[PDB]
């Protein structure tokens, strides 16, 4: 019997994969670790469902894992959420299960451990400070200069990232409730650096047995990005940087998302890496360009199966644009017909409909050259509107 | 300001080291994590003493470490106890502190992860089963043959180690109270192996920057050990086995204690390894033979100082014997003079005297050959007696 431990939230992709897998294979046993609000998503098909409110708590996870092992051993641990990456790596190493280990997972979660390893190896990285207190921000803000970026060392700073321009900006974020979000609680590690933004790139990879099965290098542009060519001058430089990070972090199997920055000097520094599949349109941008399924392939790797990576690339420069979505009662936005009129657009993906209480949509395109992209951005930027 | 986090119990060596270091250096800041019963050992000289009930609990240690960092950053973490090895490695990796990492420390604590890593590399290891329940013992006991050894996978399982000869031996350990120790709770991962009487050796090493500064290979036997010669036939293979284990576990800095078993076939298999200095007489046995201090040197390594381990070897085969100690009212034992009469003996170290409420003593010798040892061993049992 193949016992698989799945640590997922509400992401439908791994749910559909293992649900369809159980239907076609009697040997498949699915154990699920998820939140209480996600339990009905697994209750009717999964063999075992364990409810956990906080997956980050390694102590509770170890205790739970022991109880799970009593039912039977685990052959594979599948971590499809960001909060489960470090936990997944911890469980694999501690209980002798094949897959990405703790330290490898630690480098793709803890920015402090990530930046520390890269600086020791020779991989160029932006400076940083360890921040244990919001009261240490003025001290940190003066050491490298204002303004600053303050974000949690673990995970990504979704609603926990703040830009502080001055001391009196901080002291009023300190005074307002809650101007510093959950950071004021001082229960989590933080990292801080001066807001340095230039040209940004991102490299999305798929590893197996230490080798790259697939790699796509794109460039960020309302936001968006577009996939670069292998013949692009910067492609070779980013790819070798990907090689360096992979060797340093000992990457062997799984997905990867590495963000690269280019200084005005032209130096390439490493921003952040993750064991995730590219968020938003990135996953779907790749699927249109190469006609391969990142989810289907990576999940096959996670359970030690042969991934069906048959790369059939379409010609031209493929990318996507995302449209911001403000909270409230959606009254009217740009019609689908108005987008599809624009030449080069492949698909328009709405996330909301007319008359909803709340990206709003994603525009996937296919152009022949990169010059058009900055032109297309202007037209999209032009005809987009959201009234609520 | 050199901030050092010391995680120690009641071992006097690191206490004496950092207490004298603080007296001769005011820049030295000592933070201590220990149990409440060990607090007076640090309260009068250490800068900060933090009381902790369970050092193994990684979640509460992470939370505590954050509070410690608020006082100030940490330059070095010194873990001198067995329960602190994995915790220390976790804290170093998670908080970007130089020293032995999580996985490295995990391989010298978790026998399951140890045995798994060694098997993947090709390094010979005795067979084993994962035991999640004491009720799973009869299944494991029938699978490998009786008798078997059951001990916790984490730590060294002091007084949580049991020899089980039959199924009904298990059922009487199960029915009695205390007979199966703390294992009956089924709250910790356990390991199982056939109890096979074999020759065992132990290799004590000291690492720095991935290189061996010192290495000593000895042989186990009333207990004892004696240091082997570099020209000993088995010395080169055990040393080469040490290289393999170190490479697999990526050992860079700190002490090491590797136990090796030799089968009737003459095969050398890896028993156990630990990030520790050899227990009992081992440290002083080496100290008499090589005139080097494992404690003084390793502690210097832990705080990134140069140890000048200048080996001045005395001639002859040096070793020690330890004498068992029964609980009760000690009335009379073998006098020191009777020991000192025996030619070849270097020092007699008693731990108890006549009229105490409770190893009993350690006899360090210096002989020319291994044959002498078994002559001396015969002599010790002969002239040994303990009445209470």
UniProtKB/Swiss-Prot annotation, chains A, B:
It comes from Bacillus subtilis. It catalyses: an L-alpha-amino acid + L-arginine + ATP = L-arginyl-L-alpha-amino acid + ADP + phosphate + H(+). It is an enzyme of class 6 (ligase). Catalyzes the synthesis of Arg-Xaa dipeptides in an ATP-dependent manner. Has strict specificity toward arginine as the N-terminal substrate. This is L-arginine-specific L-amino acid ligase. PANTHER family: ATP-GRASP ENZYME FSQD, FUMIPYRROLE BIOSYNTHESIS PROTEIN C. Homodimer. One of its GO terms (molecular function) is metal ion binding. Optimum pH is 9.5. Keywords: ATP-binding, Cobalt, Ligase, Magnesium, Manganese, Metal-binding, Nucleotide-binding. Its cofactor is Mg(2+); Mn(2+); Co(2+). The keyword Transit peptide does not apply. Activity is maximal in the presence of Mg(2+). The use of Mn(2+) or Co(2+) decreases ligase activity. It holds the Pfam family ATP-grasp_4. ATP binds at residues 141-202. It comes from the Bacteria. Its EC number is 6.3.2.48. Mn(2+) binds at residues 259, 272.
């Amino acid at each position: 019997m193949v016992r698989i431990l799945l640590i997922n939230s509400d992401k439908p992709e791994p749910i559909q994969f293992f649900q369809k897998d159980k239907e076609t294979n009697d040997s498949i046993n699915i154990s699920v670790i998820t939140r209480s609000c996600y339990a009905p998503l697994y209750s009717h098909w999964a063999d075992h469902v364990y409810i956990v409110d906080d997956v980050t708590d390694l102590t509770v996870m170890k205790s739970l894992m022991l109880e799970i092992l009593k039912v039977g051993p685990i052959d594979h641990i599948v971590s499809t959420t960001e909060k489960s990456i470090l936990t997944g790596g911890f469980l694999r190493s501690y209980f002798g299960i094949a897959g990405p280990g703790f330290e490898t997972a630690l480098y793709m979660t803890n920015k402090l451990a990530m930046k520390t390893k890269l600086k020791m190896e020779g991989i160029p990285v932006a400076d940083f400070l360890c921040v244990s207190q919001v009261e240490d921000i003025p001290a940190a803000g003066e050491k490298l200069g204002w303004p600053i970026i303050v974000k949690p060392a673990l995970g990504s700073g979704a609603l926990n990232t703040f830009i502080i321009h001055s001391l009196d900006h901080y002291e009023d974020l300190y005074s307002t409730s809650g101007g510093l979000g959950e950071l004021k609680k001082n229960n989590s590690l933080m990292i801080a650096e001066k807001c340095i933004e230039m040209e940004e790139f991102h490299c999305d990879t798929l590893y197996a047995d230490g080798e790259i099965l697939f790699v796509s290098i794109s460039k960020y542009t309302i936001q968006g990005s577009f996939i670069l060519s292998q013949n692009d001058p910067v492609y070779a430089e980013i790819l070798e940087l990907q090689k360096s990070v992979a060797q340093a972090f000992r990457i062997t199997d799984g997905p990867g998302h590495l963000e690269i920055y280019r200084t005005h000097s032209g130096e390439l520094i490493v921003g952040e890496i993750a064991m995730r599949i590219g968020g938003g349109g990135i996953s779907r941008m790749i699927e249109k360009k190469f006609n391969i399924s990142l989810w289907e392939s990576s999940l096959n790797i996670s359970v030690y199966r042969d991934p069906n990576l048959t790369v059939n690339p379409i010609e031209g420069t493929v990318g996507y644009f995302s449209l911001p979505c403000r909270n409230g009662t959606i009254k009217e936005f740009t019609p689908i017909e108005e987008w599809e009129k624009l030449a080069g657009i492949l698909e328009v993906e709405l996330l909301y409909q007319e008359g909803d209480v709340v990206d709003l949509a994603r525009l996937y395109f296919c152009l022949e050259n990169e010059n058009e992209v900055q032109h297309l951005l202007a037209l999209v930027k032009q005809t987009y509107y959201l009234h609520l």
